[PDB]
Amino acid sequence: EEVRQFRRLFAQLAGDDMEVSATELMNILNKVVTRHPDLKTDGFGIDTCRSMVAVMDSDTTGKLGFEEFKYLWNNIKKWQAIYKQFDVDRSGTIGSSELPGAFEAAGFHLNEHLYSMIIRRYSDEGGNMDFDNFISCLVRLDAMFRAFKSLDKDGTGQIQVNIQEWLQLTMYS
Amino acid sequence: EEVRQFRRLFAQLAGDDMEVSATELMNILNKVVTRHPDLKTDGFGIDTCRSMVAVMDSDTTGKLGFEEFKYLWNNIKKWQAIYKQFDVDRSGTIGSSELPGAFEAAGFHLNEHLYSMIIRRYSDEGGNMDFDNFISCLVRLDAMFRAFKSLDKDGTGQIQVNIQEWLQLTMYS
Ligand SMILES: O=C(O)[C@@H](S)Cc1ccc(I)cc1
Ligand SMILES: O=C(O)[C@@H](S)Cc1ccc(I)cc1
Ligand SMILES: [Ca+2]
Ligand SMILES: [Ca+2]
Ligand SMILES: [Ca+2]
Ligand SMILES: [Ca+2]
Ligand SMILES: [Ca+2]
Ligand SMILES: [Ca+2]
Ligand SMILES: [Ca+2]
Numbered sequence: 001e002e003v004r005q006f007r008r009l010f011a012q013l014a015g016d017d018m019e020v021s022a023t024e025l026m027n028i029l030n031k032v033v034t035r036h037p038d039l040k041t042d043g044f045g046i047d048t049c050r051s052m053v054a055v056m057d058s059d060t061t062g063k064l065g066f067e068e069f070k071y072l073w074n075n076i077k078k079w080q081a082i083y084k085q086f087d088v089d090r091s092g093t094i095g096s097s098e099l100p101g102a103f104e105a106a107g108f109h110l111n112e113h114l115y116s117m118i119i120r121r122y123s124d125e126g127g128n129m130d131f132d133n134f135i136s137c138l139v140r141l142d143a144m145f146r147a148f149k150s151l152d153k154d155g156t157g158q159i160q161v162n163i164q165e166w167l168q169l170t171m172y173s
Numbered sequence: 174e175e176v177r178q179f180r181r182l183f184a185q186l187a188g189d190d191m192e193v194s195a196t197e198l199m200n201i202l203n204k205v206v207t208r209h210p211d212l213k214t215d216g217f218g219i220d221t222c223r224s225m226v227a228v229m230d231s232d233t234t235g236k237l238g239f240e241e242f243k244y245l246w247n248n249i250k251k252w253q254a255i256y257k258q259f260d261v262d263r264s265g266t267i268g269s270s271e272l273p274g275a276f277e278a279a280g281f282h283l284n285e286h287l288y289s290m291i292i293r294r295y296s297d298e299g300g301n302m303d304f305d306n307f308i309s310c311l312v313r314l315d316a317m318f319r320a321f322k323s324l325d326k327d328g329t330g331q332i333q334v335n336i337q338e339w340l341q342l343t344m345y346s
């Protein structure tokens with residue numbers, strides 16, 4: 001099976017403490033893109049990884065357990081495919097005009113104002129977003145959408161968040 | 174004449190487009206920090222500087238103007254001085270025990286839970302925070318506080334926000 005094969009990757013990656021840290025996450029992700037010449041990236045940095053872990057660590061352990069990691073990995077496997085598909089000019093990167101289509105393929109229908117804000121923060125001078133930036137942007141986007149949805153209990157379209165919660169959601173990410 | 178000097182710095186740094194981008198910021202920050210052996214750091218990386226710019230960019234130009242860069246620079250000068258004062262064991266990093274007092278001097282009073290989250294996201298195995306992680310964290314904490322006070326112009330300590338608003342507050346930073 002595949003769940004058999006995954007426990008095997010996980011158990012190997014997680015190591016001694018049965019959890020995968022920011023550092024371990026960084027290594028595996030860097031070990032993989034290496035064999036993907038169609039993905040341009042300057043590498044998955046430690047800071048980006050620590051952010052990926054925090055935003056994915058729903059149980060506040062500082063590291064990712066089996067489920068948390070399983071969620072992250074599956075998403076990443078699906079997202080890398082979208083990136084390749086939408087980089088129609090084989091630049092190895094997602095361009096400004098290539099972005100909306102890719103996010104939509106990943107299930108994120110935003111607006112022109114939001115894509116712009118996104119390009120400004122994650123893309124470079126040129127409007128080109130490389131692979132790590134893309135995955136990084138998507139892990140966060142997914143977490144924030146999830147976070148909003150869980151706080152929208154009445155189904156009203158708006159949430160109420162107090163100072164303590166706010167600081168917890170924005171700082172531990 | 175304390176600004177005579179500051180205008181010449183920004184102008185020299187900002188360049189042709191009259192704005193300090195993440196890369197311009199990264200360079201200067203890595204240049205100065207080296208002239209201070211009391212601050213241990215693994216370097217200011219591009220993702221972190223990209224984060225710093227995003228959070229200080231109030232005019233949504235994508236870069237730091239004079240007013241934006243000045244507020245940022247002033248804080249760093251101030252936070253740099255706090256870092257050194259509270260690094261009692263002169264390890265060159267802020268430890269778990271050293272943390273709250275340094276934030277207390279910067280003016281933030283957070284609870285233990287929040288501190289645990291911050292240490293998990295910003296410190297190392299031993300629980301020490303280096304210079305870039307310290308500045309990066311503080312630049313964020315300050316921004317997140319200001320963003321919150323700007324929507325709670327009532328003092329209730331709670332904000333109402335829709336999805337479009339939530340994304341801009343959490344994604345553009
Ligand atoms: O290359 C792989 O391991 C396959 S299973 C898919 C994949 C591709 C790229 C990344 I980064 C992660 C996962
Ligand atoms: O402004 C400077 O170069 C010195 S005096 C203070 C300072 C020290 C470190 C940093 I990074 C920023 C500022
Ligand atoms: Ca581990
Ligand atoms: Ca966890
Ligand atoms: Ca492309
Ligand atoms: Ca990158
Ligand atoms: Ca410039
Ligand atoms: Ca600006
Ligand atoms: Ca110390």
Ligand SMILES: [Ca+2]
Pocket residue numbers: 214215216303304305306
């Ligand atoms: Ca660091």
